[PDB]
Design a protein around this motif. Structure first.
Motif, PDB file in Angstrom:
ATOM      1  N   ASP A   1       2.871   5.325 -10.951  1.00 57.86           N
ATOM      2  CA  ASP A   1       2.372   4.284 -11.843  1.00 57.86           C
ATOM      3  C   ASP A   1       1.373   3.376 -11.135  1.00 57.86           C
ATOM      4  O   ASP A   1       0.335   3.017 -11.702  1.00 57.86           O
ATOM      5  CB  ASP A   1       3.541   3.474 -12.397  1.00 57.86           C
ATOM      6  CG  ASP A   1       3.091   2.309 -13.252  1.00 57.86           C
ATOM      7  OD1 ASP A   1       2.595   2.549 -14.372  1.00 57.86           O
ATOM      8  OD2 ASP A   1       3.245   1.155 -12.804  1.00 57.86           O
ATOM      9  N   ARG A   2       1.668   2.993  -9.895  1.00 54.85           N
ATOM     10  CA  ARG A   2       0.812   2.082  -9.149  1.00 54.85           C
ATOM     11  C   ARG A   2      -0.261   2.796  -8.339  1.00 54.85           C
ATOM     12  O   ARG A   2      -1.051   2.126  -7.665  1.00 54.85           O
ATOM     13  CB  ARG A   2       1.656   1.209  -8.217  1.00 54.85           C
ATOM     14  CG  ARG A   2       2.685   0.350  -8.928  1.00 54.85           C
ATOM     15  CD  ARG A   2       2.163  -1.061  -9.147  1.00 54.85           C
ATOM     16  NE  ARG A   2       2.180  -1.845  -7.919  1.00 54.85           N
ATOM     17  CZ  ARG A   2       3.075  -2.785  -7.643  1.00 54.85           C
ATOM     18  NH1 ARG A   2       4.051  -3.079  -8.485  1.00 54.85           N
ATOM     19  NH2 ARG A   2       2.986  -3.446  -6.493  1.00 54.85           N
ATOM     20  N   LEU A   3      -0.315   4.129  -8.398  1.00 55.37           N
ATOM     21  CA  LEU A   3      -1.240   4.924  -7.588  1.00 55.37           C
ATOM     22  C   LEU A   3      -1.090   4.579  -6.107  1.00 55.37           C
ATOM     23  O   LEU A   3      -2.067   4.372  -5.385  1.00 55.37           O
ATOM     24  CB  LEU A   3      -2.685   4.745  -8.058  1.00 55.37           C
ATOM     25  CG  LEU A   3      -3.076   5.528  -9.315  1.00 55.37           C
ATOM     26  CD1 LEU A   3      -2.665   4.784 -10.578  1.00 55.37           C
ATOM     27  CD2 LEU A   3      -4.563   5.828  -9.333  1.00 55.37           C
ATOM     28  N   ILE A   4       0.161   4.517  -5.660  1.00 55.46           N
ATOM     29  CA  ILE A   4       0.518   4.104  -4.309  1.00 55.46           C
ATOM     30  C   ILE A   4       1.167   5.284  -3.602  1.00 55.46           C
ATOM     31  O   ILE A   4       2.053   5.939  -4.163  1.00 55.46           O
ATOM     32  CB  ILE A   4       1.459   2.885  -4.329  1.00 55.46           C
ATOM     33  CG1 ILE A   4       0.672   1.608  -4.628  1.00 55.46           C
ATOM     34  CG2 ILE A   4       2.226   2.762  -3.025  1.00 55.46           C
ATOM     35  CD1 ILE A   4      -0.382   1.291  -3.593  1.00 55.46           C
ATOM     36  N   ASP A   5       0.716   5.561  -2.380  1.00 57.70           N
ATOM     37  CA  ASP A   5       1.278   6.660  -1.605  1.00 57.70           C
ATOM     38  C   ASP A   5       2.749   6.409  -1.304  1.00 57.70           C
ATOM     39  O   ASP A   5       3.166   5.274  -1.057  1.00 57.70           O
ATOM     40  CB  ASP A   5       0.497   6.842  -0.303  1.00 57.70           C
ATOM     41  CG  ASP A   5      -0.927   7.297  -0.537  1.00 57.70           C
ATOM     42  OD1 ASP A   5      -1.171   7.992  -1.545  1.00 57.70           O
ATOM     43  OD2 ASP A   5      -1.804   6.959   0.286  1.00 57.70           O
TER      44      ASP A   5
ATOM     45  N   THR B   1       0.798  -1.218   0.000  1.00 55.10           N
ATOM     46  CA  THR B   1       0.000   0.000   0.000  1.00 55.10           C
ATOM     47  C   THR B   1       0.835   1.275   0.000  1.00 55.10           C
ATOM     48  O   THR B   1       0.377   2.294  -0.525  1.00 55.10           O
ATOM     49  CB  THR B   1      -0.940   0.009   1.214  1.00 55.10           C
ATOM     50  OG1 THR B   1      -1.626  -1.247   1.293  1.00 55.10           O
ATOM     51  CG2 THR B   1      -1.971   1.119   1.093  1.00 55.10           C
TER      52      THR B   1
END
Lengths: 526, 96, 96
Positions: free
Chosen positions: C47-51, C25
């Motif tokens: 790219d992964r839309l991960i914080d 996450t």
């Protein structure tokens, strides 16, 4: 998991577009912070540099206050003290050419030598000198004197020898305090205990406020430092600060012009050079920044009027600039003796007090001359020219702000006028402040909206300007027009015209509030 | 490590840096949360991108299952799932 | 000698971390001060839309902290979820 693509192609996989948000755009401007900038002659400081002074550390930066016995040198520090009671500020120190700073040079063996060099000139290293160390602060090592001590240290893995440099201060009586301690190595590639780079010039430029060093590249390899205790800097003197050339003032003003920091007001800290005042007024007009200036208090009531015309400010080019005259005398707090001050900073204090009355809008409504905003609190005032009265009408024609006696026996500024020849509502100081604030906010907001497709930028500009104008109307800045038949009841009218394909115009009209300067009442019998 | 020195808050805000301060109980505390976004378009805050990323991830996962479906049925499925997710977020207090 | 690590090794480690079947996450910079590695981690986060959380080198002073953020290729609208922090203080290790 797996990557989420954007802007999917022709088949198969799904995609999510990047987050789009534009109606949420807003510009963050304080619009209430007030800061002052100025130039002056100070005992201690870095010459020709912008220095930030606050309520707590201003004394350390500017050094000890100057003695009143010396001529035309106590004014700047005391003006700064009076003006800094409200907010922080920025100062530029001017120094005569005769002043110099000390330098200590170290040979290859380690024998120290002392010299003194002028501030402007760059140091030069001769053959046989490993390096040199000088004082960046510029405070002469007289009275409290600064001394340097050197101690050995251990190596670190690579065998790069390092050493400790300690700078201490000794008073006249003999009190010794430790100011700075550092660990530096002559090797180019060196590390500290925490991993910080250990190179004498780099270390001094990074984490020191007093000392700078220059190392000759020829003798970097073969250089050794031994144990030396209590090395004292040689004699460094400051020239006569009473006489300052106009060129130095112009250079200081030019340096102050190119300052990344933002300041709201410009103050004349006891400067009576006409060229410097004209340059400061030019800066104020260019930056749309309010400015306060003071005529020399030594002149009498009759001679005050020609002095204003002598300065190149009586015209329509400089609107926000204001001038004051104050020929009285008081007593210094630090030294119990008679002194004459210039009425600069008190106006800035009144402006700051008026600004602080509101939180978000800014509260620029009130003029810097009021019953409670300006009080001029001083120990005791003795007039220098008794049995003489000024001419009020002549001062109004000449755009001069006078002083009077308040109800509670306190001297008070009873008028606020600017250096504007015409009577086109611009001689008052209340309106230019609002107009400058509006212009600055508009410039800041429009800078963000550059290079946008038509329609979207129109909506953005309209929304932002309407919000700002509504906030100002709610704060009470604008009042209904004095002519309701010819003008609409709306306090402000805004219009956007695309006009040229790439150019774009915006127009706004506002009705500033009224200022109660003269009140007249008549009795009638019924 | 650097006493007698204070930072500039406005410069840090302009540069998008999160500073630290002293709490009420004498404990050091992070007093701001900002992201590396130049514009002030509600994106410098860290609160919104987390919600948006979670919503996007859930939408991608749910839409991956509904691939290759006849029209009408997939419309009802997507509408029901997205409405349920948005109602859950509204109940949790995400949206005002 | 683990004190000196080439940028190529960091890039290879980042590339290996990119292709991981497991789901995570958040992305954390575990004491890495290489600009290329931080930019690559920010690219993965976008790219992964991960914080993502990142840290500037604590050795720099208050004045030098601001240029360091601009040195890293994260000050822009392309990386929104990434955040940065600065902490120049010192403490004591529990083990030693």
């Amino acid at each position: 998991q797996y990557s989420i693509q954007q802007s999917l192609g022709n088949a198969s996989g799904v995609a999510v577009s990047p987050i789009n948000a534009d109606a949420t755009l807003s510009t963050g401007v304080a619009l209430n912070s007030s800061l002052w900038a100025g130039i002056g002659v100070f005992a201690r400081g870095k010459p020709f540099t912008v220095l930030a002074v606050t309520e707590s550390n201003y004394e350390d930066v500017l050094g000890e206050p100057l003695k009143p016995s010396s001529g035309s040198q106590f004014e700047p520090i005391r003006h700064v003290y009076e003006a800094i009671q409200q907010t922080s500020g920025y100062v530029v120190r001017a120094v005569p050419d005769d002043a110099k700073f000390p330098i200590i040079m170290f040979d290859e063996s380690g024998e120290p030598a002392y010299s003194a060099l002028p501030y402007g000139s760059e140091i030069e290293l001769d053959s046989g000198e490993a390096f040199a160390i000088y004082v960046d602060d510029g405070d002469p090592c007289i009275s409290p004197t600064r001394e340097l001590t050197i101690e050995t240290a251990t190596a670190d893995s690579a065998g790069n020898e390092r050493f400790l440099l300690k700078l201490t201060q000794t008073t006249s009586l003999g009190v010794v305090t430790t100011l700075e301690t550092h660990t530096v190595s002559l090797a180019e590639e060196a590390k500290d205990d925490m991993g910080r780079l250990c190179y004498l010039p780099t270390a001094l430029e990074a984490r020191s406020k007093y000392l700078r060093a220059v190392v000759n590249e020829e003798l970097i390899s073969t250089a050794k430092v031994t144990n030396k205790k209590s090395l004292a800097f040689t004699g460094g003197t400051n020239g006569d600060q009473s006489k300052i050339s106009t060129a130095a003032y112009l250079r200081a003003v030019k340096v102050l012009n190119n300052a990344p920091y933002m300041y709201t007001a410009v103050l004349g800290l006891g400067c009576y050079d006409n060229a410097a005042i004209t340059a400061l007024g030019k800066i104020c007009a260019d930056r749309l920044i309010d400015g306060f200036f003071d005529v020399k208090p030594t002149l009498t009531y009759a001679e005050a009027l020609p002095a204003v015309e002598d300065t190149g400010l009586l015209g329509t080019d400089y609107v926000s600039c204001s001038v004051y005259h104050y020929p009285f005398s008081c007593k210094d707090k630090w030294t119990q003796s008679r002194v004459v001050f210039g009425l600069s900073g008190v106006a800035y204090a009144a402006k700051a007090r008026g600004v602080k009355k509101n939180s978000d809008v800014g509260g620029w409504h009130y003029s810097p001359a009021g019953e409670e905003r300006a009080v001029i609190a001083r120990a005791s005032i003795q007039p220098l020219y008794p049995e003489d009265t000024p001419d009020e009408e002549a001062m109004v024609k000449g755009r001069l702000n006078k002083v009077s006696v308040g109800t509670s026996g306190q001297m008070i500024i009873d008028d606020a006028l600017t250096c504007c020849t015409q009577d086109n509502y611009l001689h008052f100081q209340h309106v230019p402040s609002l107009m400058n604030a509006i212009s600055r906010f508009f410039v800041q907001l429009a800078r963000q909206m550059k290079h946008s497709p038509d329609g979207i930028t129109a909506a953005g500009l309209t929304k932002g300007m309407t919000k700002l104008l509504d906030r100002f109307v709610a704060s009470g800045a604008l009042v209904a027009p004095r002519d309701p038949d010819a003008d609409g009841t709306e306090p402000y009218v805004l219009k956007v015209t695309q006009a040229e394909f790439d150019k774009w115009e915006v127009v706004w009209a506002c009705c500033p509030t009224g200022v109660a300067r003269r009140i007249q009442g008549v009795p009638l019998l019924i």
